[PDB]
Amino acid sequence: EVLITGLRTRAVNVPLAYPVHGTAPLVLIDLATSAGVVGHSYLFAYTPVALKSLKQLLDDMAAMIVNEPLAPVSLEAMLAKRFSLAGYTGLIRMAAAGIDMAAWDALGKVHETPLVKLLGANARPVQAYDSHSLDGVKLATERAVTAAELGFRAVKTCIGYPALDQDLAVVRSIRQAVGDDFGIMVDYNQSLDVPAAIKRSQALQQEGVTWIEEPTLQHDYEGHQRIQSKLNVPVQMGENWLGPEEMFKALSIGASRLAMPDAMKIGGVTGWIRASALAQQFGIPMSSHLFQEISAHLLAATPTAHWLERLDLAGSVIEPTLTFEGGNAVIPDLPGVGIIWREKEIGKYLV
Amino acid sequence: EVLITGLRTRAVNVPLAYPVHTAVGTVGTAPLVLIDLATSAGVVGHSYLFAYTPVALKSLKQLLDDMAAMIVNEPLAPVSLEAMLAKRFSLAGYTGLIRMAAAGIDMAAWDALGKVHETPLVKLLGANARPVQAYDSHSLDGVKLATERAVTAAELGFRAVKTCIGYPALDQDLAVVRSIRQAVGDDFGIMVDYNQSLDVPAAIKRSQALQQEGVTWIEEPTLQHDYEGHQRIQSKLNVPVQMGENWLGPEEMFKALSIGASRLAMPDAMKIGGVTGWIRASALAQQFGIPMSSHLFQEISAHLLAATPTAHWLERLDLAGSVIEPTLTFEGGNAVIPDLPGVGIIWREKEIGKYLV
Amino acid sequence: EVLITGLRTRAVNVPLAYPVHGTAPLVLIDLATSAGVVGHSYLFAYTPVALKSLKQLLDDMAAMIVNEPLAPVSLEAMLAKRFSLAGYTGLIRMAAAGIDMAAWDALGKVHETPLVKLLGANARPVQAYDSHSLDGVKLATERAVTAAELGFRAVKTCIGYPALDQDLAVVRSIRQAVGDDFGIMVDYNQSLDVPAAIKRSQALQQEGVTWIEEPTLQHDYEGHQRIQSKLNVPVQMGENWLGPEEMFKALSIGASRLAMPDAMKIGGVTGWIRASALAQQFGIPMSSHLFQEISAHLLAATPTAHWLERLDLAGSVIEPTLTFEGGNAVIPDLPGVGIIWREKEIGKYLV
Amino acid sequence: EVLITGLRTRAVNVPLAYPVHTAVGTVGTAPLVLIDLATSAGVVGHSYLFAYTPVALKSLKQLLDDMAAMIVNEPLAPVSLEAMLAKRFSLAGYTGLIRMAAAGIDMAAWDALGKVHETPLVKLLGANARPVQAYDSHSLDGVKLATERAVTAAELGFRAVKTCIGYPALDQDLAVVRSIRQAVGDDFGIMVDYNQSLDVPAAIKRSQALQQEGVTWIEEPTLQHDYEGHQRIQSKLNVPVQMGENWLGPEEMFKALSIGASRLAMPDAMKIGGVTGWIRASALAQQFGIPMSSHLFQEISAHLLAATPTAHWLERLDLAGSVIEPTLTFEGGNAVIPDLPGVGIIWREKEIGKYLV
Amino acid sequence: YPALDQDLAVVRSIRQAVGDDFGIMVDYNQSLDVPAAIKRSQALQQEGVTWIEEPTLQHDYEGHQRIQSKLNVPVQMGENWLGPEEMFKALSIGASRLAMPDAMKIGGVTGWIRASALAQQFGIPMSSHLFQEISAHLLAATPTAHWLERLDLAGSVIEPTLTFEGGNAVIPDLPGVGIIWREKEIGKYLV
């Protein structure tokens, strides 16, 4: 009945509300169907260096998916098989996930139903934390105050300054400004070796933080386990898992007490739902990484849903239909994901 | 926004096309609870439960009728309903009859949700319909009847059959399996089911003899809850051990897979927790590298296996055929999903009246 | 020689001495024998939703057991085999256990001997704790004072309030009122995920509690192990094990340093005695859950007996032959379990 | 309320119907300590101990006589007495001779308790009497005598026999086992017992040859306390390894089962800790999925196996037949519990006088 | 059957139904040429059959000899011998290790007795073909008696005075052969 009829991609470098210590390289995806609906998703390329490559890959993948049914699960299986030799990971897997997210958006539109309801769940608000960067004491404290004013009950800051004392000064200044009934997540963004991570993390633990994220190299699951083994505070990781199979290797060894898959890297909706099944059985509270628009839907269907990360990479090109009430993400009452392009703005940012 | 507006159940004892022969004697009927889940969209979801023994039948019907109070007026959102039932039954024990009743609700809710969207369940789950190889399931039949049933199954187009073994002597098991082989030829599957009847060392001895014979798998060689025991049996075999029909929820499956209890899995759509449980089970089987087959509930399992990354076989054991229209068909031994919304279950209303308890 | 001749069940909703934050759904069981004695037991249905189902199941099981010898061990084997396909767990296993407890009561009567002596043990008093609920600071403190006055040396309170600070306020107020030479057990009743359980439990540990019970989902033995691994205070669990086989899976992985089987869920007397053998070898102090009347006998025969839970669900329909002296349960000098129906009261509560 | 009021012991060296042939020579008698536990109910509990070698006989009798002081005037409550003896001997070591003496008390106390209630022990333990398959136990007999004994056992109705092997050459072991097979035919069990005589690699080599032969199990291939060694031998075999006759208390059994030392178990009613220890052992064997047989003490083991969920075989090796009435009978090779209170042991008082030490 | 694997499948299936201590005779009913008979028979022999009967054309005694020469299992034949003189020709060249005359074709009682004397001298165990009523008598007088064929062609029209106990035919205590017509039944079937 419903077939894919075309794929269009647009590579953009878009401005960010708050610069990271100023633009995000994105691939915006339109998936045309025989039912007249168009699915939308986007990818984050992390670095402009990967941006044209990711767009080129998707365009070259158009011939593989055009005329195939709009069945994301069957499409995912087909792509997994076709890329089994090239390696169904990294940019290839990201591109497949962009297709998956646009296909589920389209399937939601075909049925005139928000994605969360198509998944069999009710919409519910999800607590969100406001994600900042390696901002220094002044700006980190400022941004936390602003977030608290807006109703967010937690913030994340990036740490990993040259000295542990600088990490601690940032956390202490945030804590003074927001008080004790407030979440402070800290992200080391893979910056430390295992011994340095144990030392810094035990000091931060005494400080009072909500979680310690990616203390060491992301692929080092055993290293994360050794760090977690020396901590009472939970270690958080998962944004870098490419597919539920990478997540499964990390969970199988007990690398961390929390998980936060990235909707793109984990494999889109199809991968997210598989990830959610694993986190449930392993008893891991599961949060999101980026992709706040689709992650609101996904978390509502996730048995161990924990936090949504608010980090609005695509706001300059996507209508703000996702809203926050008392720090909670509220899924819009729109079919599929609720992504609507800001078409006038896209033209400004094309690479 | 679509709400559940009613739950009706009917207990029936229905005739089986293949009477099930056991060590005790022959059972000619199956105890089922037929479920109708009414909605504010007007469509009605259909599912059913198998109660296994008439002893459990009225109790299971009573439990579902009492559980109606928990779900009527809730939104038709199976994942959310499941979470609520799991929490409400956390003290009583979200397992056994309670879990089976919750699964009957879940299966009817997904059938209703398919109907709300006028789409076959497989498509709602995001997959394409595909034919799925099916084996014909027989019983503890002895040589004469096993041969007769195997010839019939081959003539119908099936490419495998399953027989129940666990006779008093290993030579009896071997005799039945060898006889089936003569009837079906070499390029044909013979699954064997010990139905939990052996201790570990007897299972290792019998299974090694069966393995030399050429069987497709050895199913539930010992007590179902003894996952460590299945692991010890599997460790001595090249043929795969099959189990899973008795897992109550994905959490039981998870425990068995975590210790490597078997190289194959076959969840029961009811006991595993309905569609919602099956999808979670499918994600575990994929990660653990376990080919996944079905147990009973052929109507819904044809949909579910089409969405299962490691789909293996569909079990054809047609418990509800007297009371459900044969919209599921078989071509070349492969189950063919009907082009109907939801699961494609249409009651045979005139027939149901014959069998009510 | 002695045969079962009949089974009668009565479903009741009975009032509770202290309401849980007010009635208990019970199935009262009479097992008639050819020796003229009648065994008594009862089941707890947890929720009225399961009550009629459990009674119906038992009535339908009557034909399986009538004319069988009064041999609880052989009867248990028969029921295990007959329910091997349906699943010998949940309500079915509970119903089998109700039969088992009434059969051992009858066997005690046949021999005119209290159950504890039939089991080969001497009666001894067993320390009991008074079990309360999620009562708030005022009522929890009140109930603990009342329990201390009555001679109990420990109480259990249910915690898991929205904030950890509320858990702590309850425990601190109880502690002030009862002093330092007194047991305060805390029960989370499966309310927390593993990270939240580690955090709350380490805070409660610093407070001074006797044990932390069911911090997370009961079937999650691995999660309980991970929680226990971060604690000095013992984790307690077991009330939800259906059969000694579930207990064995939890003990085999070291899920908790304490165990408390429920006489019904564990499989009656037959299951309890098996459970007791496992707790002995694994070195686990073993307490009871509910069923105080039979648990007094059972604990006297348990090598690692720890505490009896006083939580009098059936008092409104059972004569108070079990007494407490200095907080210790005293087994009555009566044949079998010492259960005598309050027949006038039963009529008031029939469903 | 019923109190122990006396303990009498008698050391005897009794004639064996089957002299036991060993590598050294033939032993024609067994050293036993016969136990009478008097009570305030008037009934007297009977049990006995096997001392294994006459070297231990007087020491074991002396130990029991001295232990009398701990139990006379205590209530006849075997579980409570056991706890007290375990605590009192915690420093000396609650194992070996001390543990065996405590077990003799326990077995006599349960026999007395059966008598107090005028009920067979099996019924007191909550089970029905059922016949239990028995194998006839022979010794290191060589070809001529093993064949002769095997023919006699088959004529008596036994369906299995056990022979002792561990000759200097593997071909000798094989020769004896093959000869027995000719005498009994193919549908008959042959258990083999190495009686701790091999090192691990020799046991693996010999056992793989025996396995090809068709034996029922391979018993105690290496030193009894080397559980890891039994595990390593079992890991190389399809045939099950059997052990357990030398476990002193359930705690020793527990250590062996925890590492997977063997697929079968056979506690000795004395060494395992009497009835009280046997019941605990039975609960462990059930959970670990181990079929459980007996070692010696056929009179009490017929009761105990009837209460054992994984009951497997009863060992017929009639050490005390000269001094105990043959109230235990065999029909079709199955031990039949006599309808007598307690264990059904009645002393042959005229015979005992012949054999006193 | 058209394929050897089909023959083997049927024989193996029978074996599962009856167990190991039970005879399975196989009859090719003259259907094979000599080399096919040698190939099929060697496969059947590995299977465990009791005998291989009439593997090729009945009058080809030399052909039966050549087939028998390649087998350990015995070749059976003789149902088609017309008179002892035909039996004599086959035995003289060693056509088969077993014989089974048909009471009719061999020449009745008179022919059977002569056939029995030949089978004795040639050392051939001798069974019957059809005519179970008279063959029970005749085999009792046959020094090398082997098996009686139970194939009850005339049961609808002859009283069942021949009985079977433990699979053994029991001669009735009646004069002559013990054949008593079922006169009411015969009328149903007349041509």
Ligand SMILES: O=C(O)C(O)(c1ccccc1)c1ccccc1
């Ligand atoms: O967790 C994140 O959001 C992230 O790891 C990330 C990584 C990559 C891209 C966007 C966010 C992070 C955010 C801010 C500063 C450092 C790291």
Ligand SMILES: O=C(O)C(O)(c1ccccc1)c1ccccc1
């Ligand atoms: O696998 C099955 O279908 C089953 O285990 C079963 C169990 C319970 C109900 C229906 C089918 C089985 C099949 C054939 C013979 C015995 C058992």
Ligand SMILES: O=C(O)C(O)(c1ccccc1)c1ccccc1
């Ligand atoms: O441990 C208990 O007694 C129990 O877990 C329980 C559970 C279910 C029924 C009765 C008692 C508990 C008691 C009071 C409050 C919460 C939990």
Ligand SMILES: O=C(O)C(O)(c1ccccc1)c1ccccc1
């Ligand atoms: O298993 C036995 O009975 C025993 O180990 C034994 C050991 C010690 C005393 C009695 C029996 C055995 C039997 C036959 C040959 C050698 C050993």
Ligand SMILES: [Mg+2]
């Ligand atoms: Mg991060």
Ligand SMILES: [Mg+2]
């Ligand atoms: Mg099965």
Ligand SMILES: [Mg+2]
């Ligand atoms: Mg509790």
Ligand SMILES: [Mg+2]
């Ligand atoms: Mg031995």
Ligand SMILES: [Mg+2]
């Ligand atoms: Mg012929």
